[PDB]
């Protein structure tokens, strides 16, 4: 019904993970996957296992990004597969990461010190229906654990309230969305060594 | 019904370390295609693209030592809307360098004007910026939504100023377009997400 809102189930990579990466000694690898599709697509990362092979209503359309962090030197080449799902649709893409040819570090041992926050699960774009309850993710990789703050569509810090709740896992829950809620939402993740941020565009999918 | 909002405001105060290059960033989102202009040393006083929505990021580069504190204002415009925000940058306490003189030698590319998101009408022509600060001038390469290098062709053209022109966009054009700016020192990259839509009556252009 060529407003895209009526075409569930569909799912497309918007950032396909690299086919191959070469790890430098001591480097932290971040493998990024991004996809967009009907409803709220989920992304799972699978290590070391290669792939082997409806309502009469509009749906949300969500663009979601997930990062896999390798913060140790690999002992051997390993495969990492991004698996995306929404409804009955599944898409996959894999990355082979190669270890450095030589290393002055212990392989497969997590790098020791503090680590700057990285937001590793986030929605870039959330197009939805008015009145819906939405939950915007902000999952973080950080040592020590990051403090999470959300800004709303007026750049004001969000405090816990009747229609807005910040969850312990970093998610922002907004109940019964309306036009006045539309726009940009920013997650800020901070610890003693640094900060990361991520923006989510929330907008009506229809009319 | 135009709207325009900051998504990243520049810092209100910055301290320049001696010999340091400062990059001031402002990001905004709005209807049509908002533009960002930087105004130096003048504190504020008191194309059209219907159906488009764009996130735009602009950087101002200070690659000289300041002789005195200076103000930098990010001014955004779209339709009849104007927004702005300012930064004061302070010079180093002491400097062994000549003030206001551009730092010598090569500089790694910085992409200083880019759209993070370009939502626009099916059938329309879009022009995605990739403005670069680099010495020597950077080589610019775009990759399409399948990570393949874009060559000059029928619906795709790369301009001398770095812009990617995509003619008569269709649903299959949806996705991320990467600008790579490279010179002898290194590279910078940026992604632009393109989302083709229909107009207010669910039609493509024309």
């Amino acid at each position: 019904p060529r407003n895209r809102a009526f075409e569930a189930d569909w799912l497309k990579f918007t950032k396909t993970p690299p086919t191959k990466l070469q790890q430098a000694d001591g480097a932290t690898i971040e493998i990024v996957c991004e996809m967009m599709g009907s409803q709220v697509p989920s992304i799972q990362w699978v290590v070391g296992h290669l792939p082997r092979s409806a309502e009469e209503a509009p749906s949300a359309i969500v663009r979601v990004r997930s990062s896999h962090i390798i913060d140790h030197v690999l002992s051997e080449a390993r495969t990492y597969t991004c698996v995306g799902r929404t409804g009955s649709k599944t898409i996959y893409a894999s990355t082979v990461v190669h270890p450095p040819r030589s290393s002055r570090l212990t392989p497969e041992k997590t790098y020791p010190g503090a680590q700057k926050p990285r937001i590793i699960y986030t929605e870039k774009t959330h197009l939805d229906l008015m009145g819906s309850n939405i939950q915007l993710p902000c999952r973080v990789h950080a040592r020590p654990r990051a403090e999470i703050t959300w800004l709303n569509n007026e750049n004001k810090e969000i405090v816990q309230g009747h229609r807005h709740r910040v969850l312990a896992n970093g998610d922002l829950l907004i109940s019964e969305i309306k036009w006045e809620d539309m726009g940009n939402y920013k997650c800020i993740a901070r610890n003693v060594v640094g900060k990361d941020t991520a923006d989510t565009f929330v907008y009506p999918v229809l009319n």
Side-chain angles (χ1 to χ4, degrees), chain A residues 113-119 140-144 146 189-197:
Chain A
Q115 301 187 237
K116 186 188 184 69
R118 301 174 190 242
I119 295 166
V140 176
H141 177 280
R143 297 175 179 115
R190 291 190 183 94
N191 69 8
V192 72
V193 13
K195 170 175 62 65
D196 198 15
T197 71

Side-chain angles (χ1 to χ4, degrees), chain A residues 7-8 12 32 42 47 56 58 63 78 89 91 95 103 130 135 155 186 205:
Chain A
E7 313 283 356
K12 182 191 188 189
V32 181
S42 65
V47 180
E56 300 173 354
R63 181 167 64 116
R78 298 193 190 278
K89 286 298 210 298
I91 63 177
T95 299
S103 175
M130 298 306 94
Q135 185 168 320
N155 293 309
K186 183 191 303 293
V205 70

Side-chain angles (χ1 to χ4, degrees), chain A residues 76-164:
Chain A
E76 68 184 40
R78 298 193 190 278
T79 65
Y80 302 81
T81 301
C82 170
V83 183
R85 297 173 178 98
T86 189
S88 60
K89 286 298 210 298
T90 304
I91 63 177
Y92 315 82
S94 306
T95 299
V96 178
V97 183
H98 300 263
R101 298 183 185 183
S102 55
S103 175
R104 61 183 81 216
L105 311 173
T106 299
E108 303 286 333
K109 178 173 184 297
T110 304
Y111 302 140
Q115 301 187 237
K116 186 188 184 69
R118 301 174 190 242
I119 295 166
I120 59 172
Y121 204 100
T122 182
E123 286 176 5
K124 301 291 278 207
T125 315
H126 189 115
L127 311 179
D128 216 323
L129 298 168
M130 298 306 94
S132 64
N133 304 311
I134 70 175
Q135 185 168 320
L136 307 182
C138 185
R139 306 296 159 91
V140 176
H141 177 280
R143 297 175 179 115
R145 184 186 178 116
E147 296 274 348
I148 301 300
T149 302
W150 282 89
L151 310 183
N152 66 13
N153 61 341
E154 293 190 335
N155 293 309
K156 306 301 189 309
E157 176 172 347
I158 293 175
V159 308
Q160 304 277 12
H162 308 291
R163 315 176 47 233
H164 303 72

Side-chain angles (χ1 to χ4, degrees), chain A residues 2 6-7 43 48 62 70 96 100 113 125 136 138 146 156-157 165 188 196 201 203 206:
Chain A
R2 73 184 59 186
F6 301 109
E7 313 283 356
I43 305 177
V62 169
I70 305 167
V96 178
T125 315
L136 307 182
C138 185
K156 306 301 189 309
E157 176 172 347
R165 294 174 174 80
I188 304 159
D196 198 15
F201 179 40
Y203 208 68
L206 288 185

Side-chain angles (χ1 to χ4, degrees), chain A residues 2 10 19 35 44 49-50 65 87 91 94 98 109 122 125 130 132 146 179 182 207:
Chain A
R2 73 184 59 186
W10 66 275
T19 61
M35 63 191 58
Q44 179 194 11
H49 296 83
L50 283 183
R65 181 181 182 167
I91 63 177
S94 306
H98 300 263
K109 178 173 184 297
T122 182
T125 315
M130 298 306 94
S132 64
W179 175 246
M182 305 296 95
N207 81 94

